[PDB]
Write a protein that binds this ligand. Structure first.
Ligand SMILES: *NC[C@H](*)CC(=O)OC
Ligand SMILES: [Mg+2]
Ligand SMILES: [Mg+2]
Ligand SMILES: [Mg+2]
Lengths: 229, 75
């Protein structure tokens, strides 16, 4: 529908408030990830059911994304039917899409308020295709409004809606024994190998490391973990 | 004295500071070295979030301590 939204801040306070407003109870809460070594990862509460990674969508990154897409289309990969994937068709909605991917793929572990708007979105879109889900989001006012409100929160001031954004959010989740990167800009989830309920954080961080070493001149990365509380 | 600030990517930024320096001052020093605006910075010491108004001494941050820097970026 051509709409443009504002980019969300990679901040647990912002994301946790967004989830609260969408009707999710707080026994799952995002937390910051301070580093990638065992000592810093040990500070992250367990279990962890999703990791949202903010990274730079630079020219170097796009070259890799293009290669990755062709490789997967030409060589194939496995993607279980259980995975909930939705496309991105709204500019700057990546934060909302990342949050939807994180909750949708862990829905049975969540505690929702009776009239939770996120629960409603997920129940109504459960059997829709990734494309239909994107169209549905384009018409789902409740999430559009909450995203807008959340976009104004944070340590930083929200930018103009027309300003260039070169940072993106993706979700890393564990579904049926594999680690999936869910990026609405891509044509499909990306299977990154095996993982488990207990090692999701560590395995997701190894993928984050890959993103970083591909763009050695960039420091603009942020990872938040959806942890039990 | 020197303290080290580590980013998520693992980069170590070395700063020359004083116990009396406020967190705000430390962030400004990080901006001068890395170009990262203070607003986008969230500093951590031993698992504790640091607030702009307090000083390194307040948090008992001594010589050669390592702080962790989280970036409040918008995606
Ligand atoms: N941070 C906004 C979502 C990512 C994006 O802009 O995709 C181009
Ligand atoms: Mg609620
Ligand atoms: Mg605990
Ligand atoms: Mg369920």
């Amino acid at each position: 529908e051509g709409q443009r939204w504002l980019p969300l801040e990679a901040n647990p306070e912002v994301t946790n408030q967004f989830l609260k407003q969408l009707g999710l109870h707080p026994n799952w809460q995002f937390v910051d990830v301070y580093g990638m070594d065992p000592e810093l990862l040990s500070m992250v509460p367990r279990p962890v059911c999703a990791v949202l990674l903010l990274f730079p969508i630079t020219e170097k990154y796009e070259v890799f994304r293009t290669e990755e897409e062709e490789k997967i289309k030409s060589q194939g990969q496995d993607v279980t039917s259980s995975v909930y994937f939705m496309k991105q068709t709204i500019s700057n909605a990546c934060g909302t899409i990342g949050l939807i991917h994180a909750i949708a793929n862990n829905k049975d572990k969540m505690h929702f308020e009776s009239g939770s708007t996120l629960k409603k979105f997920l129940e109504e879109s459960v059997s829709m295709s990734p494309e239909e889900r994107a169209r549905y989001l384009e018409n789902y006012d409740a999430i559009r409004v909450t995203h807008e409100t959340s976009a104004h929160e944070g340590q930083t001031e929200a930018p103009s809606i027309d300003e260039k954004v070169d940072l993106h959010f993706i979700a890393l989740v564990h579904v049926d024994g594999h680690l999936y990167e869910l990026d609405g800009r891509k044509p499909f989830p990306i299977n990154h190998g095996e993982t488990s309920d207990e090692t999701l954080l560590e395995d997701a961080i190894e993928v984050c490391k890959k993103f970083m070493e591909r763009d050695p001149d960039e420091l603009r990365f942020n990872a938040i973990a959806l942890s039990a509380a | 004295m020197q303290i080290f600030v580590k980013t998520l990517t693992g980069k170590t930024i070395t700063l020359e500071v004083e116990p009396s320096d406020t967190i705000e001052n430390v962030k400004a020093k990080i901006q001068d070295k890395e170009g990262i605006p203070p607003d986008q910075q969230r500093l951590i010491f031993a698992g504790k979030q640091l607030e702009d108004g307090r000083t390194l001494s307040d948090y008992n941050i001594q010589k050669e301590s390592t702080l962790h820097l989280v970036l409040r970026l918008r995606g």
